[PDB]
Homo-oligomer: A and B are copies of this chain.
Amino acid sequence: NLQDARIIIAGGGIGGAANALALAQKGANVTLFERASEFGEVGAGLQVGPHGARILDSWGVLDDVLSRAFLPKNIVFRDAITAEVLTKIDLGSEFRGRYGGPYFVTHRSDLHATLVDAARAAGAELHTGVTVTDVITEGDKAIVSTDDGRTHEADIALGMDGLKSRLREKISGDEPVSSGYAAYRGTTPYRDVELDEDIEDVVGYIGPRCHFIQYPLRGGEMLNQVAVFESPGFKNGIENWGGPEELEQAYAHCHENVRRGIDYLWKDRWWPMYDREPIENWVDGRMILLGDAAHPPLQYLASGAVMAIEDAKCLADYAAEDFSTGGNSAWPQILKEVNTERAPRCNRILTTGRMWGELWHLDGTARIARNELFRTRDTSSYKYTDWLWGYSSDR
């Protein structure tokens, strides 16, 4: 266990919160700083596959999370132009038995609040309204500086400050890479959505230069909707690219079921999709980057938060194993071994994520080949997903 260990965490997103929980359950002294004045996430959906669900269960928060979540029966891919079913992934008992947990969807906000509360209950000291301005290593401590003039000593620091991380600059000067696709969200009361059929699945309509995703939340009361389209604005160098004026032209070619959905999206806010080129080294002395700071993906595999949750389990588990026997001295070896386990796993998600996305968005004859590939696959095979959903950091 981690009794005498002091850890500081810069950033209190899903990733920071999950690390505070995982370390604090091991007996670590955890201090986390979050810039915004409250802990909060977007009131829209996210997907958490069994690779996350397992981990949440091992912290004892899955039952609670599930009580406010939705359990879809399948992931259903449809053609965005014809609305025809291309294939299904069955999320039933075979699926759960193979991967050790359910595939679920919930409100990001509720998942987030659940992790913050349990991290608090486990002993983490969380601070809102505090910006980390610098981290350096000196001797065998991490020295962390905040925007209220104070400095702080810890055994290690976690840089969990997101896609636009400033702590990343200690390790790499790369910048976010635009995909040229923008995401819009919406949650609707379920009844109030004009639906031809009912939805108890995660449904992905995939089309030339767009996609459209739908799933129920909170026991089938609301329906989460997500639209992702290639921005003509981005190619012409617009700075605030992907605005709602592009929406109607982007989906004009698509099936009515897809076009109906555009109306329910929040138009006052959207998410341009950037990621970063994969990097191998995430450690600077006694600082490690985790979460989106280390490995921000495009969202086609629905796995970025999950990756940050894995980061949390791997770090907590590996430190608990080596700290008991090696003390504060052992911290850099711990970080290196976390880095080594986590880098290939996460970097394959970033790279494969890009290829998966391109596969969704193909046109012409390429679309016809892709449709046929999907329809005719062996649905009892798990070769396309074991690497994703069947990973574990356990050694």
Contacts and interface: CB of A to CB of B under 8 A. Distances in A.
Interface stretch (A16-24, A285-293, A318-326, A369-377): A369-377
Interface in A372-389: 372-373, 376-378
Contacts of A369: 359, 362, 366, 369-370, 373
The 3 nearest A-B residue pairs measured at CB: A366-B366, A358-B365, A373-B373
Most B-side CB within 10 Å, residue of A365, A370, A378: A365
B362 A366 contact: yes
Nearest to A361: B365
Contact of A373 (B355, B364, B372): B372
B368 A355 contact: yes
10 contacts: A355-B365, A358-B365, A359-B365, A362-B365, A362-B366, A369-B370, A373-B373, A376-B376, A376-B377, A376-B378
Nearest to A360: B365
Nearest to A372: B373
A370 B374 CA distance: 11
A178 to B, nearest CB: 18
Contacts of A359: 365, 368-369
A358 B362 contact: no
Interface of A: 355, 358-359, 362, 364-366, 368-370, 372-373, 376-378
A357 to B, nearest CB: 9
A350 to B, nearest CB: 15
Contacts of A378: 376
Contacts of A358: 364-365
A301 to B, nearest CB: 15
A230 to B, nearest CB: 14
A208 to B, nearest CB: 12
Contacts of A366: 362, 366, 369-370
Contacts of A377: 376
Nearest to A364: B358
Contacts of A373: 369, 372-373, 376
Nearest to A356: B365
A376 B378 CA distance: 9
Nearest to A369: B370
Nearest to A370: B369
Nearest to A373: B373
A358 B362 CA distance: 13
Contacts of A372: 373
A362 to B, nearest CB: 6
A113 to B, nearest CB: 38
A377 B368 CA distance: 15
Nearest to A378: B376
Most B-side CB within 10 Å, residue of A362, A369, A370, A373: A369
Given A359-B368, A362-B365, A376-B377, 13 more contacts: A355-B365, A355-B368, A358-B364, A359-B369, A362-B369, A369-B369, A369-B370, A369-B373, A372-B373, A373-B373, A373-B376, A376-B376, A376-B378
Contacts of A376: 373, 376-378
A368 to B, nearest CB: 7
A372 to B, nearest CB: 6
A377 B369 CA distance: 12
Contacts of A365: 355, 358-359, 362
A72 B369 CA distance: 27
A362 B368 CA distance: 12
Contacts of A370: 366, 369
A365 B300 CA distance: 15
